Design a protein around this nucleic acid. Structure first.
Ligand SMILES: [Mg+2]
Ligand SMILES: [Mg+2]
Ligand SMILES: [Mg+2]
Ligand SMILES: [Mg+2]
Ligand SMILES: [Mg+2]
Ligand SMILES: [Mg+2]
Ligand SMILES: [Mg+2]
Ligand SMILES: [Mg+2]
Ligand SMILES: [Mg+2]
Ligand SMILES: [Mg+2]
Ligand SMILES: [Mg+2]
Ligand SMILES: [Mg+2]
Ligand SMILES: [Mg+2]
Ligand SMILES: [Mg+2]
Ligand SMILES: [Mg+2]
Ligand SMILES: [Mg+2]
Ligand SMILES: [Mg+2]
Ligand SMILES: [Mg+2]
Ligand SMILES: [Mg+2]
Ligand SMILES: [Mg+2]
Ligand SMILES: [Mg+2]
Ligand SMILES: [Mg+2]
Ligand SMILES: [Mg+2]
Ligand SMILES: [Mg+2]
Ligand SMILES: [Mg+2]
Ligand SMILES: [Mg+2]
Ligand SMILES: [Mg+2]
Ligand SMILES: [Mg+2]
Ligand SMILES: [Mg+2]
Ligand SMILES: [Mg+2]
Ligand SMILES: [Mg+2]
Ligand SMILES: [Mg+2]
Ligand SMILES: [Mg+2]
Ligand SMILES: [Mg+2]
Ligand SMILES: [Mg+2]
Ligand SMILES: [Mg+2]
Ligand SMILES: [Mg+2]
Ligand SMILES: [Mg+2]
Ligand SMILES: [Mg+2]
Ligand SMILES: [Mg+2]
Ligand SMILES: [Mg+2]
Ligand SMILES: [Mg+2]
Lengths: 122, 98, 244, 75, 95, 240
RNA sequence: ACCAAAGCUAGCUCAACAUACUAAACAAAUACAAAAAUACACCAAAAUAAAAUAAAACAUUCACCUAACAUUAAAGUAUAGGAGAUAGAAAUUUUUAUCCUGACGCUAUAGAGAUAGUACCGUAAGGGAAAGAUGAAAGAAUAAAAUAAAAGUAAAAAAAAGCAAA
RNA sequence: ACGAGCUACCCAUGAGCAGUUUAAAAGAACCAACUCAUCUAUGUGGCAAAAUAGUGAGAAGACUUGUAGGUAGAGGUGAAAA
RNA sequence: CUCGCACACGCUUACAUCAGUAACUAAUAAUAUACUGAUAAUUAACAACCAAUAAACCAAAACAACACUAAAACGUUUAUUAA
RNA sequence: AACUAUUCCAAAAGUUAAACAACUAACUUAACAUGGACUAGCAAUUUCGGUUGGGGUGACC
């Protein structure tokens, strides 16, 4: 009676059925029928030099935790744009038209990593 | 257009309630077919002079075929309407003048 | 268990919540009231009271409309508020004979009609009844403006009407670009139907089209929190400057 | 976007990256976000089923209270 | 006979009874004779008379007709000019 | 479900093109025509049925073509011929004695003197003698041949009246046409196709014919020998 | 003496109220052969419900029968009907708030199908189960405690003769 | 509503047919693989909800057969056996 | 005594190693390819996935010389672009 | 009944004379296509009264 419940996988069908397990495509099919890899699609791991740096996978037990404050858009506004805006309004140099000097970005399409359509994996 | 009538009398609902319909209320008898009536005529006011019918500024009665498919599309006539009629009242008063 | 509100009212209270709430009131009031369509196929008796022929007594009498079916191809033309009559008949009209399903279909024609206000010739499927109503109302454009939504029955009729209603409320110059004489002359006779602009673009609309339109007018990209925080900060700084 | 699928459920539809715009896309174009008229009936059933479950979860809890109050009448 | 109607849950009357009989208030039912309009040229004067009568139904029939008829048809009626008002009560019945 | 017809190929080719038989089934999949299916596999040769077809619209005149080969065709009863002129080849339906290495004239030109008719020649009907044998007959001018293409069939030109030709179809019915319509002169190929003897039921299957049904039907009123007066004459001439 | 027996819980049922009415959960993947990131299109649509049955047959007819308008009456009245079976109004009338929500409803063959739309059975639509019982503690199993009562057997084969008893 | 993964008939697309006899791949002949299912005996809650043993009929054809597709119940399909 | 090895389709870990089998699967045992547990395992060269648009080509497969009739599956090259 | 073909009337589009005699009618019809009829095909719904020296035939009611 075949099998209803067990999931549908490349192991199950005929020769003609190949369904990946969910790894991401690195390329396309070329002229010779041979497969071509696109160096840009292959994720390049960015790994910092860890050797000269002191932090460890675990933390000392007598070391204290702290009162837990989730970072909010407000707190981030106040630690960054608030001192600068206050400095330039107190000096009357404040310009409601261009906020770009404070770090505000009008549109995301220029820069490499955009936040809203979210150009980057991790 | 077919004008049709029910064979079974529907009961009443009077308060503004909608009538309670049964399937037997879907049985119709055919009282009339409008398309088979002896057909009426159309009354028009000519804005030019038509060959057979008559002069510019004239009130004529034709069969709806000639009126719909010839005169009205060609701007050779306009409808008998009161607002359109007073125009030719005035035209009749200012014609016989000079 | 029981629903708290009857399911007849779920359509109505669907319109009191969500985006339907934010629709313009005149539109919702055009949808709310369903006026009884002009009798077409059945032929109504005038009086409310009628003397029973057999009984010789005064009898209350009502008019019950005959259910009529409008095939979707009727929405592309103007059929004069008529349609298919689905029903049954007795053969021979003896009640004692077979009872048989029967459908009465309107006779359709291809006719091209001229609209003055929209200045155009449309090729439309119409009935003889539509032509008679156009004749009776003395103009194509008249007939379209002069008749209620229920009596036309066509979505195309309502779109014709929405179009020329817009052309009237706007006094659109593009009607007759060369001759303001003709333009004023035409806009003249129809001056009775002129309605404001906010009203004129909502006339012929399906609830779908309406909801869509209202969704597009409300379309806004959410404002960056940098803006809002900057305005709170300027409020606070201007109240710190004015207090000293 | 919030959409309504064939089954009449209100679903949150995540978007997908495509090299071509949506009206030129075969595969995407043959999905349907909207319900047909029959679906309405089932939607109703869904509600009702849901309502029942909630209804008799509630009645359960209520009952559990009464029992306990006669088991431990420290009030 | 319908003992419990659908809409009202009441007990209907069989109209076919109401058309051919007449219930006095005493409980007597009254009926025309059968075939009294039929083929008159072929019948005796005497027989014709026997037919033209209004007659009473036996007990069994009376109970039957009562069952086939609701309570309304058994009420005491006062009609103006009524031929039958004379006959509604019973007198001198020793039973 | 829905099947798509094999019959879509836009450009004309002399090369044999592959085709799919469908035994009696319409595009819905039900049987429409009984008794059809599974013959031998067949390729299809496209036939040009418009005999007068100027290669380029630049030079309109009557032109001449050479017959290269005369081949068997699976699709029709008549034998067909490969005909080349200018830069183009096409298949045409071969007349009875048409042989390889031959010359055939295609002409639209009329004239007061008619013409001495060879076989492969195509002329407007008006241009032929009044007793001639014709095949591949147009109906309206420019339409292309429909009538009289079967093997060994020939019609005959009967008369010419009022800028119009009246011809006799192989069914012995008369047909009236403008005299500006083209026809080929002669009897179609393979005249003995009538006398061929299918030897065994098998051969019938090879031809893609499935056996008759087995049900017994009593003959009805329709059967008998009906002798009907020959039908009135068909006229494709459109009167003003 | 075996097989067995006994629990009182799991949950349910019916109403009330109620806001208002597609629960929960969504990182990725999901309408390629659902759960398969990535290429030039197509996309979509509606037509009266029918019959079993009642009429002791069946042919017109046959309440309810997935269309909001309730209630007290008018009234099973007027009417409609092979004037049969049956069907059946209206005009006109009546209707006083909110709290006092629970149970002369079930307790594992019952109450939901439900420990579950799972196992299993069907190619599919679809059909659709059964099953629990120690105690305060089993972090008290050389374990301690109250039925030993169904048919079936065992302890214990049978001894002329007969509806098996009287 | 669901069903043509069995089976009836189609459509696409593949695959098989050795030896012998014959000028011959001729719906010829002998006889395997292969396909059928004649006659008998077993079996009859069976090995089997149609089989086993022997025996038979066809075996380059109107042949067998794989894969994918089609036709749907007022229907389909049918070398009619309802 | 002789239905063997492989592939397709299908099945889905039932395969392998170590251990256990009082009872559960084997229509019975011994023990174990089928019961139980733990731990492992099939590695691409084979196979799937793997271009479009124009244009020249009438000329069967049958050891293919050449033919038969029922007229027959199966591609080169040239041009234009092909990450 | 529907459906499929036939035939006809009406609907719809038209076209002609200014008709005839003395001192309004008639005709036309490409494909669709409506209402009402006609003739067939293909069909749809429903039924097989009882008595009987078993039923049936015969007879009877
Ligand atoms: Mg299964
Ligand atoms: Mg696979
Ligand atoms: Mg495999
Ligand atoms: Mg590679
Ligand atoms: Mg052929
Ligand atoms: Mg041939
Ligand atoms: Mg035959
Ligand atoms: Mg026969
Ligand atoms: Mg009955
Ligand atoms: Mg009974
Ligand atoms: Mg019966
Ligand atoms: Mg019913
Ligand atoms: Mg009557
Ligand atoms: Mg009766
Ligand atoms: Mg009332
Ligand atoms: Mg239970
Ligand atoms: Mg249960
Ligand atoms: Mg015992
Ligand atoms: Mg004794
Ligand atoms: Mg198959
Ligand atoms: Mg051989
Ligand atoms: Mg042989
Ligand atoms: Mg055998
Ligand atoms: Mg032997
Ligand atoms: Mg053998
Ligand atoms: Mg043999
Ligand atoms: Mg033999
Ligand atoms: Mg299939
Ligand atoms: Mg039947
Ligand atoms: Mg059949
Ligand atoms: Mg067969
Ligand atoms: Mg037979
Ligand atoms: Mg038979
Ligand atoms: Mg298995
Ligand atoms: Mg193992
Ligand atoms: Mg064992
Ligand atoms: Mg019936
Ligand atoms: Mg009998
Ligand atoms: Mg009898
Ligand atoms: Mg006898
Ligand atoms: Mg006897
Ligand atoms: Mg007899």
């Amino acid at each position: 009676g075949a099998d209803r419940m067990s999931k549908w996988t490349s192991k199950r069908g005929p020769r003609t059925f190949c369904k990946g397990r969910g790894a991401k495509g690195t390329g396309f099919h070329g002229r010779d029928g041979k497969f071509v890899q696109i160096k840009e699609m292959i994720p390049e791991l960015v790994v910092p030099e860890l050797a000269g740096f002191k932090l460890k996978p675990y933390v000392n037990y007598r070391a204290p935790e702290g009162t837990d404050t989730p970072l909010t858009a407000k707190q981030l506004f106040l630690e960054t744009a608030a001192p600068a805006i206050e400095k330039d309004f107190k000096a009357g140099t404040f310009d409601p038209e261009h906020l770009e000097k404070y770090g505000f970005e009008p549109t995301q399409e220029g820069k490499l990593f955009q936040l809203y359509p979210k150009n980057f994996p991790r | 257009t077919v004008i049709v009538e029910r064979w079974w009398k529907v009961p009443l609902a009077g308060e503004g309630r909608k009538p309670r319909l049964h399937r037997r209320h879907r049985v119709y008898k055919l009282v009339e077919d409008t398309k088979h009536r002896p057909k009426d005529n159309l009354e028009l006011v000519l804005t030019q002079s038509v060959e057979e019918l008559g002069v510019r500024g004239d009130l004529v009665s034709v069969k709806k075929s000639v009126g719909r498919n010839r005169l009205l599309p060609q701007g050779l006539a306009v409808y008998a309407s009161p607002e359109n009629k007073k125009l030719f009242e005035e035209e009749k008063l200012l014609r016989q003048e000079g | 268990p029981l629903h708290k509100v009857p399911v007849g009212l779920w359509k109505q209270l669907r319109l009191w919540e969500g985006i339907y709430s934010r629709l313009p009131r005149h539109y919702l009031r055009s949808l709310e009231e369903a006026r009884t369509p002009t009798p077409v196929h059945y032929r109504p008796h005038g009086a409310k009271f009628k003397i029973n022929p057999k009984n010789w007594q005064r009898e209350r009498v009502e008019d019950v409309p005959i259910p009529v079916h409008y095939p979707p191809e009727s929405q592309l033309g103007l059929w004069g508020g008529e349609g298919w009559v689905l029903g049954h008949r007795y053969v021979n009209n003896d009640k004692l004979s077979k009872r048989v399903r029967k459908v009465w279909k309107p006779q359709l024609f291809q006719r091209e009609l001229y609209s003055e206000i929209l200045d155009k010739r449309f090729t439309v499927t119409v009935t003889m009844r539509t032509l008679d109503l156009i004749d009776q109302a003395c103009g194509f454009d008249f007939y379209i403006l002069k008749t209620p939504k229920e009596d036309l029955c066509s979505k195309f009729g309502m779109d014709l009407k929405r179009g020329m209603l817009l052309r009237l409320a706007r006094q659109d110059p593009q009607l007759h670009p060369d001759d303001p004489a003709r333009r004023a002359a035409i806009y003249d006779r129809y001056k009775a139907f002129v309605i404001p602009e906010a009203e004129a673009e909502w006339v012929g609309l399906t609830l779908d089209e309406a909801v869509e339109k209202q969704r597009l007018l409300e379309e806004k990209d959410p404002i960056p929190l940098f803006k809002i925080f900057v305005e709170e900060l300027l409020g606070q700084l201007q109240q710190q400057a004015l207090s000293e | 976007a919030w959409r309504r699928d064939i089954f009449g459920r209100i679903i949150w539809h995540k978007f997908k990256q495509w090299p071509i715009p949506w009206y030129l896309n075969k595969k995407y174009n043959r999905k349907r976000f909207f319900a047909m008229p029959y679906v309405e009936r089932f939607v109703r059933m869904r509600i009702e089923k849901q309502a029942r479950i909630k209804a008799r979860k509630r009645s359960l809890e209520r009952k559990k209270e009464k029992f306990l109050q006669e088991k431990f009448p420290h009030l | 006979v319908t003992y419990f109607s659908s809409r009202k849950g009441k007990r209907k009357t069989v109209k076919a009874v109401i058309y051919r009989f007449l219930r006095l208030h005493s409980g007597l039912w009254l009926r025309r004779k059968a075939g009294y309009k039929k083929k008159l040229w072929k019948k005796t004067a005497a027989r014709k008379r026997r037919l033209r009568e209004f007659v009473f139904c036996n007990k069994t029939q009376s109970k039957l007709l009562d069952k086939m008829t609701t309570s309304f048809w058994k009420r005491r009626n006062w009609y103006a000019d009524d031929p039958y008002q004379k006959y509604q009560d019973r007198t001198n019945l020793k039973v | 479900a829905t099947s798509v017809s094999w019959k879509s190929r836009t450009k004309y080719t002399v090369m044999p093109v592959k085709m799919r038989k469908s035994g009696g089934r319409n595009h819905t999949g039900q049987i429409q025509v009984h008794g059809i299916g599974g013959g031998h596999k067949q390729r299809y040769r496209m036939i040009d049925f418009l005999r007068f077809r100027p290669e380029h619209e630049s030079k309109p005149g009557p032109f001449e073509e050479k017959v290269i080969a005369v081949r068997y065709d699976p699709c029709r009863s008549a034998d067909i011929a490969l005909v080349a002129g200018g830069n183009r080849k096409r298949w045409i339906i071969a007349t009875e004695n048409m042989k390889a290495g031959d010359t055939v004239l295609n002409s639209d030109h009329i004239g007061r003197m008619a013409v001495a008719a060879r076989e492969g020649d195509a002329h407007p009907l008006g241009a032929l003698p009044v007793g001639t044998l014709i095949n591949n007959v147009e109906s309206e001018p420019g339409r292309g041949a429909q009538y009289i293409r079967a093997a060994g069939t020939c019609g005959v030109l009967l008369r010419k009246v009022n800028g119009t030709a009246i011809i006799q179809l192989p069914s012995k019915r008369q047909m009236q046409v403008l005299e500006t319509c083209i026809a080929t002169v002669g009897r179609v190929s393979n005249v003995d196709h009538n006398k061929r003897v299918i030897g065994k039921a098998g051969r019938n299957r090879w031809l893609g014919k499935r056996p008759n049904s087995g049900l017994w039907q009593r003959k009805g009123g329709w059967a008998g020998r009906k002798i009907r007066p020959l039908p009135p004459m068909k006229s494709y001439v459109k009167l003003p």
